[PDB]
Amino acid sequence: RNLEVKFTKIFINNEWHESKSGKKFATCNPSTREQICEVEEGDKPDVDKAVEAAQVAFQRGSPWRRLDALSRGRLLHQLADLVERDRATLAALETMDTGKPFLHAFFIDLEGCIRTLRYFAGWADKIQGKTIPTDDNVVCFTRHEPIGVCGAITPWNFPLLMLVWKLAPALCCGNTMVLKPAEQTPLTALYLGSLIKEAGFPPGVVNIVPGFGPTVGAAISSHPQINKIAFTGSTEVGKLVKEAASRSNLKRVTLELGGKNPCIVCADADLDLAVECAHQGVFFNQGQCCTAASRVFVEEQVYSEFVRRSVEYAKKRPVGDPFDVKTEQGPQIDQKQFDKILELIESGKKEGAKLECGGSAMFIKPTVFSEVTDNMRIAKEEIFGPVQPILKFKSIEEVIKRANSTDYGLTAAVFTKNLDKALKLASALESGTVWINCYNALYAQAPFGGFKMSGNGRELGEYALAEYTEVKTVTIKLG
Amino acid sequence: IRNLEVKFTKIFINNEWHESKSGKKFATCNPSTREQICEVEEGDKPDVDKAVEAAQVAFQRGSPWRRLDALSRGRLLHQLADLVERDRATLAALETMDTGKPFLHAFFIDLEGCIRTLRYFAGWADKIQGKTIPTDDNVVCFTRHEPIGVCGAITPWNFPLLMLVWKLAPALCCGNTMVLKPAEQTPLTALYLGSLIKEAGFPPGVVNIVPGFGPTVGAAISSHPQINKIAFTGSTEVGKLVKEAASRSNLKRVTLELGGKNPCIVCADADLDLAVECAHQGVFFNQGQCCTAASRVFVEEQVYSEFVRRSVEYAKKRPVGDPFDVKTEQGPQIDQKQFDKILELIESGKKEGAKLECGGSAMEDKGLFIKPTVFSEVTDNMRIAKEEIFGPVQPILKFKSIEEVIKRANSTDYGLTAAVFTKNLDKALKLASALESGTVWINCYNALYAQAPFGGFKMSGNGRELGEYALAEYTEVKTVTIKLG
Ligand SMILES: NC(=O)c1ccc[n+]([C@@H]2O[C@H](COP(=O)([O-])OP(=O)(O)OC[C@H]3O[C@@H](n4cnc5c(N)ncnc54)[C@H](O)[C@@H]3O)[C@@H](O)[C@H]2O)c1
Ligand SMILES: NC(=O)c1ccc[n+]([C@@H]2O[C@H](COP(=O)([O-])OP(=O)(O)OC[C@H]3O[C@@H](n4cnc5c(N)ncnc54)[C@H](O)[C@@H]3O)[C@@H](O)[C@H]2O)c1
Ligand SMILES: COc1ccc(-c2cn3cc(-c4cc(OC)cc(OC)c4)ccc3n2)cc1
Ligand SMILES: COc1ccc(-c2cn3cc(-c4cc(OC)cc(OC)c4)ccc3n2)cc1
């Protein structure tokens, strides 16, 4: 209920720290506008410090480096155990900090945090190079060593999850990390730093430096002693991080960004499954989600009954308090976007699109657009709010071209009972994940990540391990 | 072959030759005789835009190329490698003409390396393999390793045709399409291959070649919003530029290979005669102008002197002269910028206080050649020891303990390659593990195989080439996750 925030400082070498400037910023609560607490405002000197602590704890011969590969997973299981223990604490904090429904934060976010952690615990002693057939007198092989100090920079929509998805793989491969969390949502990250010292990782293996994007985050992406970065958030902000990494240190960068992620309904598709899952992927977590559906193509044979059954759904879903055990949808975080959404609601009005339900606030009331075309703004642009822009199509080959036309591509969900229509579509769509008769079906063992401008690199899979290893070749010649 | 005329100097788009949309041209010179081979078309963004739209369409869904069978793709690559072998002495000549590589070197290394690489990756085409992943009882989930799309490739002058092939083979077996820009210093063989690409029967628009200049064609490729992936072999300087440009627009995926301060450790318990021979050809091969050249040579005290003495006779004994001669080992350096720039670094050596055991100045001024040069008593903070010299210079150093030289070699930001010589099982391996280098040879030098990946650690690269690992850089992972009733 009323839960005290106990950790608010820079986490470095498993000791709690103050800004080298003593500056502080103050996270608030989107549910009820209320300053939660005051967190230390780190910055380049603070970063500079943690990055050194990471280099030391990564140095050869350190207690971290010498750990038996399986004891690396022992820790990772220990940390997951702890997360498991203090689970609702985290769900509570993550709710206070983001305004997610407390259950949503308890059964999705933290279930994902716990599962993702143990999955990569598995991999710690299964990271295998190759032994390669070359010449008769030559032993050749490759090792998959850890890259070094790893930079993690995450968004406020799934703070602890987006954070674990980078921490779990990075630590099993045996890097050390400097973590830098949103400003909107720094609480759960800072908690996990307690759990990290408790499970007993060596000091300096993980370090957290909360603060601001252009200050702290930008210090990371430019730092000469960080060897890799993982970023989850804004397309355009990723562009800069890639740039800075390139200008300084040539570090390895992997990004996960947004997208106009399509949602395709065929004539023979289960309609209640299609309509409802199209709903879960436009209105879940208040519409702000890496996996949200910018576009919803529907074949002419089921258009109106699709559009009709859709508007029935929007009006019945409960809004209100986040600690509500009867709600689905809390508030938005930063009104900076609140403006441009219910502006975009007029974009479709202005270009000739029927608005079948909703279109203003009370939060925003869930909205639905029929008669939408491709060229309208409300189908050209990502929307971090509930806006269901429903289009129409004759051919499978038609919607293939239409849905693939944007420069983004992180998610596509297809709905059909037909075997040929399922597979033909999946193979064609230029999307990192293609879901079929389901939405937001993320698993810790299937890689997530972007095609085209939705990012580069993958996360959550055996493929994740690639982004946290440098491949060394040994080539030995005998006499 | 001697007075062989250059047949190929135009731009290759959709398997048609072309002139500059501009009309301009530019010359390539023979560095051995310092005279002009001929003029090639100078491309620019409007040329690059032409080729990209070509490639964009040869990769379009249902293209002859995309509907093509997977093993047939393999067959074409095997087909193109046949042609190379046939026209091998044409190409190797062209390569020596353009670069002053000893011709025999280009025919037994360079071109050999090209055919072998084309064949390895030809073999990977029907064996690009994704995963099926267990998840819940009611879900089928699996991954496909789709091709990326239009892949830029941009390569230097030190191995013009080999650096091109290292990218073309994997990308082409993986089902991509390509816009290639060779170095302006060395455009001849990249064009010849384009002739063979067409003969081998590749669909038009699957490979395209626009020659021209770094800032002009190069950057137009790196920034182009419809190119989906770049490979770059070149300098660290240009390397940071190209990754930056890709970041600024279209967020392309970028893989980079760019030189190093490549350590060559020689332990006291070392076949010394092998160490001098390999750490000699290691330093000096290809006129010392190599991505993997040997720059800092660490030797243990117990053997420091007699190593140096053995290195210095090799240096004088090793033949320099006409590339077409069958007894040559070191042709000329590539151009005037390099020759002066290397000659200058020599003086920093003299003037930073290091015994000039041999050579030390250029010879027979009417050529672009340099006396093979050795140094002694070279300390760390010294200039010959901190910077990539791209030429014949052999700075030797003293070292005491293993842990001394582990720390000393991982002191740079580079780390493309390293050699270690010892007979000691634990030394070789302890060194092999601790060195921050991409490849680590042991009791050999310059041992590249297509099956083994090659690439940089730290500021020497991102990603790899020539291995099953190259496929990673030319495929995009998709996850298909089906749910059942
Ligand atoms: N003003 C507009 O036109 C407009 C419109 C809609 C949405 N938006 C975007 O919505 C975003 C919502 O926040 P978000 O976290 O989901 O995305 P984001 O890109 O802001 O996420 C950035 C993450 O990285 C850090 N970061 C921020 N700026 C950085 C920089 N310049 N260099 C390095 N690291 C940096 C932050 O601390 C946070 O961790 C805003 O950042 C904003 O760009 C803006
Ligand atoms: N006439 C000339 O300008 C000229 C001639 C000889 C030598 N040089 C210089 O000699 C050095 C030799 O370097 P190297 O060839 O080993 O590698 P490099 O990094 O100089 O060039 C690698 C390749 O990158 C391409 N490139 C160059 N600059 C680029 C840019 N800004 N954007 C995009 N692509 C670009 C070029 O076509 C070249 O083939 C370079 O400094 C080179 O430019 C220049
Ligand atoms: C309609 O009722 C449902 C209630 C609940 C679920 C449901 C989804 N879940 C997802 C995870 C998980 C793990 C992640 O990283 C591994 C990422 C991620 O993002 C979605 C989710 C864990 C548990 C879970 N349960 C489905 C249907
Ligand atoms: C003294 O006994 C020998 C035994 C074996 C060899 C030997 C090594 N080789 C390496 C290549 C090759 C291939 C490349 O790409 C695949 C790149 C590259 O660049 C340096 C070289 C080609 C031929 C070759 N032969 C020599 C001498």
Residues in chain A: 479
Within a domain: A62: yes
A162 CB near ligand 3 (under 6 Å):
no
Rounded-to-10 torsion of CA B320, B94, B184, B45: -170
B242 CB near ligand 2 (under 6 Å):
yes
Q: What is the spatial distance between Cα B17 and Cα B41, in angstroms, rounded to a whole number? A: 10
Partner-chain contact A473 B440, CB within 8 Å: yes
- For residue B197, the domain's CATH number is 3.40.605.10
Residue with tokens 């308890």: A106
Both tokens of residue B111? Answer: 């071109």
Q: What is the spatial distance between Cα B49 and Cα B342, in angstroms, rounded to a whole number? A: 37
Our CA angle for B304, B309, B314, nearest 5°, is 125
Our CA angle for B163, B167, B171, nearest 5°, is 170
Contact B448, A135 (CB under 8 A): no
Contact A389, A381 (CB under 8 A): no
Q: What is the spatial distance between Cα B366 and Cα B362, in angstroms, rounded to a whole number? A: 10
**Burial bucket for residue A386 (CB in 10 Å: 0-12, 13-18, 19+):** buried
Q: What is the spatial distance between Cα A466 and Cα A246, in angstroms, rounded to a whole number? A: 20
Does residue B421 belong to the interface with chain A, where contact is any CB pair within 8 Å?
no
Residue with tokens 């670069």: B99
| CA-closest candidate to residue B297, choices B221, B377, B240 | B377
What is the maximum span of chain A, computed from C-alpha positions, in angstroms? 81
Query: Is there a single domain that holds both residue B282 and residue B211?
Result: no
Partner-chain contact B483 A441, CB within 8 Å: yes
Q: What is the spatial distance between Cα B233 and Cα B236, in angstroms, rounded to a whole number? A: 9
Q: What is the spatial distance between Cα B365 and Cα B403, in angstroms, rounded to a whole number? A: 45
Within a domain: B448: no
Within a domain: A371: yes
Both tokens of residue A205? Answer: 């293996």
Q: Which residues of A are catalytic?
A: 256, 290
Query: Is there a single domain that holds both residue A327 and residue A223?
Result: no
Type of residue at A198: E
Distance from CA of B317 to the nearest CA of A (A): 25
Within a domain: A2: no
**Which residues in chain A (231-290) have CB-CB distances under 8 A to chain B?**
235, 238-239, 242-243, 245-247, 249-250, 252, 255, 257
Residue with tokens 């050795």: B374
Query: Is there a single domain that holds both residue B105 and residue B157?
Result: yes
Ligand 1 center from residue A159 Cα (angstroms): 13
Dihedral (CA of B209, B214, B220, B223) sign: positive
Contact B474, B176 (CB under 8 A): yes
Within a domain: A447: no
Query: Is there a single domain that holds both residue A38 and residue A83?
Result: yes
Query: Is there a single domain that holds both residue B298 and residue B188?
Result: no
**Burial bucket for residue B429 (CB in 10 Å: 0-12, 13-18, 19+):** middle
Q: What is the spatial distance between Cα B345 and Cα B341, in angstroms, rounded to a whole number? A: 6
Query: Is there a single domain that holds both residue B378 and residue B347?
Result: yes
Beta bridge partners of B297: B264, B396
Within a domain: A295: yes
In ligand 2, which atom is closest to the CA atom of B184? 37
SS3 for A249-269 is CCCEEEEECCCCECEEECCCC
From residue A251, give the alpha-carbon distance in Å to each of A150, A164, A223, B279, B413.
9, 21, 9, 30, 11
B154 CB near ligand 2 (under 6 Å):
yes
Query: Is there a single domain that holds both residue B161 and residue B250?
Result: yes
Within a domain: B87: yes
Instruction: Calculate helix-pair angle for B70-86, B88-99, nearest 10 degrees.
Output: 70
**Resolution stated for this PDB structure, in Å:** 3.2
Query: Is there a single domain that holds both residue A366 and residue A416?
Result: yes
| CA-closest candidate to residue A198, choices A6, A20, A42 | A6
A310 CB near ligand 3 (under 6 Å):
no
Measured by CA distance, the residue closest to atom 17 of ligand 2 is: B234
Residues 6+ apart with CB under 8 A from A257: A232, A233, A234, A235, A238, A408, A410, A450, A453, A454, A455, B251
Q: Left (φ > 0), alpha (ψ -120 to 50) or beta: where does B286 sit?
A: left
Residue B178 phi, psi (nearest 5)? -135, 145
Query: Is there a single domain that holds both residue B183 and residue B104?
Result: yes
Query: Is there a single domain that holds both residue B136 and residue B210?
Result: yes
Measured by CA distance, the residue closest to atom 35 of ligand 2 is: B214
What is the maximum span of chain B, computed from C-alpha positions, in angstroms? 83
Beta bridge partners of B289: none
**Which residues in chain B (350-369) have CB-CB distances under 8 A to chain A?**
none
Residues of B in contact with A474 (CB under 8 A): 432, 439-440, 442
Contact B345, B384 (CB under 8 A): yes
Contact A7, A191 (CB under 8 A): yes
Q: Which long-range contacts (CB under 8 A, 24 or more apart) does B108-112 make?
A: B110/B159, B110/B161, B110/B162, B111/B84, B111/B161
Type of residue at B247: S
Beta bridge partners of B330: B320
Query: Is there a single domain that holds both residue A228 and residue A271?
Result: no
The total number of structural domains in chain B stands at: 2
- For residue A350, the domain's CATH number is 3.40.309.10
Cβ neighbours around A26 below 10 Å, total = 11
Q: What is the SS3 assignment for A149?
A: strand
SS3 for chain B is CCCCCCCCCCEEECCEEECCCCCCEEEEEECCCCEEEEEEECECHHHHHHHHHHHHHHCCCCCCCCCCCHHHHHHHHHHHHHHHHHCHHHHHHHHHHHHCCCHHHHHHHHHHHHHHHHHHHHCCHHHCCCCECCCCCCEEEEEEEEECCEEEEECCCCCHHHHHHHHHHHHHHCCCEEEEECCCCCCHHHHHHHHHHHHCCCCCCCEEECCECHHHHHHHHHHCCCCCEEEEECCHHHHHHHHHHHHHCCCCEEEEECCCCCEEEECCCCCHHHHHHHHHHHHHHHHHCCCCCCCEEEEEHHHHHHHHHHHHHHHHHCCECCCCCCCCCECCCCCHHHHHHHHHHHHHHHHHCCCCCECCCECCCCCCCECCEEECCCCCCCCCCCCCCCCCEEEEEEECCHHHHHHHHCCCCCCCEEEEECCCHHHHHHHHHHCCCCEEEECCCCCCCCCCCECCCHHHEECCECCCCHHHHCEEEEEEEEECC
* Pocket residues: Cβ below 6 A from ligand 1: A 153-156, 182-183, 213-214, 217-218, 221, 233-234, 237, 240-241, 336-337, 340
Q: What is the spatial distance between Cα A369 and Cα A348, in angstroms, rounded to a whole number? A: 8
Contact B377, B297 (CB under 8 A): no
From residue B336, give the alpha-carbon distance in Å to each of B185, B287, B288, B342, B439.
11, 14, 16, 10, 31
Q: What is the interface size between A and B, counted as CB pairs within 8 Å?
A: 172
Report chain breaks in chain B, C–N > 2.5 Å, as residues after which they occur: none
Contact A451, A409 (CB under 8 A): yes
Contact A150, A170 (CB under 8 A): yes
Domain range enclosing B247: 11-259+460-481
Does residue A466 belong to the interface with chain B, where contact is any CB pair within 8 Å?
yes
Instruction: Calculate helix-pair angle for B160-173, B111-122, nearest 10 degrees.
Output: 10
Query: Is there a single domain that holds both residue A254 and residue A366?
Result: no
Q: Which residues of B are catalytic?
A: 257, 291
Rounded-to-10 torsion of CA A64, A170, A113, A217: 110
Beta bridge partners of B393: B373
Q: What is the spatial distance between Cα B281 and Cα B259, in angstroms, rounded to a whole number? A: 17
Does residue B70 belong to the interface with chain A, where contact is any CB pair within 8 Å?
no
Q: What is the spatial distance between Cα A46 and Cα A178, in angstroms, rounded to a whole number? A: 11
Q: What is the spatial distance between Cα B132 and Cα B144, in angstroms, rounded to a whole number? A: 9
CA A170 to chain centre: 15
Within a domain: B371: yes
